[PDB]
Amino acid sequence: RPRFSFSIAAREGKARTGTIEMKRGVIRTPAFMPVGTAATVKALKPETVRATGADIILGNTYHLMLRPGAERIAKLGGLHSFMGWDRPILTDSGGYQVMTKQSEEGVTFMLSPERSIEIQHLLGSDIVMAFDECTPYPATPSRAASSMERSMRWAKRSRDAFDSRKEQAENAALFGIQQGSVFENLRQQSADALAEIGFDGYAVGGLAVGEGQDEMFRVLDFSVPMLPDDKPHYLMGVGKPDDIVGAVERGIDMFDCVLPTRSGRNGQAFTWDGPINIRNARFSEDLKPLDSECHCAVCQKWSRAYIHHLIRAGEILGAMLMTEHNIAFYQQLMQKIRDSISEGRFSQFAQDFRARYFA
Amino acid sequence: RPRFSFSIAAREGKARTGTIEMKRGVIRTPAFMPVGTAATVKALKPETVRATGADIILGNTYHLMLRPGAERIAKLGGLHSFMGWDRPILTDSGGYQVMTKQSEEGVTFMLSPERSIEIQHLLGSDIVMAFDECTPYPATPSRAASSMERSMRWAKRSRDAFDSRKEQAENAALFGIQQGSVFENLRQQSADALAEIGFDGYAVGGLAVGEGQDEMFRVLDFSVPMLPDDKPHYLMGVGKPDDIVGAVERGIDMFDCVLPTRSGRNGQAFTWDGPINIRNARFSEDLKPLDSECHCAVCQKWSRAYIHHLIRAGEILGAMLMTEHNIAFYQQLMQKIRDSISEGRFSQFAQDFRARYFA
């Protein structure tokens, strides 16, 4: 395999399906990336994450640079070896989660474009995110513009830091992040600056920060077409099933979110008929699986009533089973989206999905 | 298979190795039984418990009768179906863990010999423990005697309750529990009373309650020979690796303990060179597996340094990996004990084990 090759195999409207080939593996797009924190996808062995269908996972830079330390992980052989995941890993740049002392050089809380890129190198990341300033929502246009402009200066710094390190440049990929809050002109300036610099993929940053789905979709409507069509489009931090479907309808190829893992541990199970909270007393004697159609190992073997008991009791197996189901559900969603675009029936799928999910 | 058949295949001194055949499976003896609580072996899927080599697990009566309820579990199909373990289950009688208002009828806190036997029936237990009064340590001889005598009255009540229920009598087995604290004459009276009543197996109760290994071994020395030789001998609540080895040297066939699961979640890992606490800073960059010879999946794939990180971080995968290793270690110990008795070299094994474990 190549360092990086994105190929689009089929299209429907603005939606695309295809593949990213990297040295450590192939990523089917549109892709959902389960999130680790602290070098683990919470409550799952890597082999379980893979069995759900995940092709890539996100590593948590912020946590790891604090514990156990990026240099320690490199000493130990890198994140893949450390945690036992041998397929691609995307790492965020660490600044969204830091967001103490902010300046043009970076932030102390320390992190700069150069140090972020070096930490991701030490971790052995396959997809490296440029270091950016996420812009709070709402933002005035002045503030949005200042932030975006800083982020684009930091994007060039990130590019040059990555390219400076031969090992990294030859084996990893680098994504830039579009800012500009909800303002179309700032989103355009941002897209143009990133395209001039040139990246292997382009994230849409600064969304899912409190604006709500209608506003998120409105900004995606104009923002995603601004990015280079022939590179992947990553919507950071999104999201709920219905958010994913509409974002693919608007040209997004990649997704990450803590929703399935975090809310699973809290009792929320995704189903094709909408989310359920398994702690609810109505499930205490319900012998059906979490979802009626789901192919995961959890739905093949255990009832709602058992998982209800486990979560009510605070048992670790409860978090394990809920998280495996939720991540499997997300992967099954992505598979249905891929197959429906490939068959030219995604718009029908989206409508059918919504009718039933919100029934 | 039969309801219950214990066959001794080989002997060495007082040690025995053999098999218990039951309808749901065969149990290799000497056996270690992982403990659930709340219808789960903490942090493990049943298939993982089986992969470690366990032939039977213990269910936690006390917890289950409170949550989710014994009648609810029966409504749902019984404990085996509920939790997904289709092999034998031993259930304790619930009184050790209760130990509010104690009387000849039983205890309120409610539980009596009859209700304990019925709860174990509702759970669908394969090996049912008689309901007894555990005797605190230390105990005066008067107090020990009174308690033992009550327990033997309750043992007959348990026998008659079990036999009254045809379904239970035909498909499950019933064990009696010897009391008498550390007093040989009371242990003899107890053995004699239980033998007169007749049980499928005999537990040694009332030990591992604070007396220390030397005293535990002294009481086993005279107590186990008092029990019928041709039935299994169960030492309840024992214990550390070294306790297990010496107890098999004294004629014990079955063991249960929370030590491997509970202490695993706390950072303690068993190894052939003695226990280690993985939280210790000395492991932070140690690339070796938890134990150098262990065949478990955890030692094949992850380092001490990773598990150290996980437990320090309070990550659920840490508890999962530590518990799988510890239960696998215990099962490997039992296998070495079985093979060494079968080959007439157990006394050598015991000496070698101790020299290295305490090196």
Ligand SMILES: CNc1nc2c(CCNCC3CCCC3)c3nc(N)[nH]c(=O)c3cc2[nH]1
């Ligand atoms: C939920 N919304 C959201 N998340 C955003 C994130 C994070 C995406 N997820 C990373 C994981 C979080 C735990 C470890 C890795 C964002 N990140 C960056 N760098 N810039 C954004 O504008 C940015 C914007 C984001 N919006």
Ligand SMILES: CNc1nc2c(CCNCC3CCCC3)c3nc(N)[nH]c(=O)c3cc2[nH]1
């Ligand atoms: C650790 N020592 C110890 N435990 C004893 C236990 C419990 C054995 N383990 C049962 C599991 C605990 C959680 C759910 C099932 C004892 N039980 C009974 N009935 N009588 C004893 O003398 C008795 C004596 C015991 N001594």
Ligand SMILES: [Zn+2]
């Ligand atoms: Zn499922």
Ligand SMILES: [Zn+2]
């Ligand atoms: Zn091991």
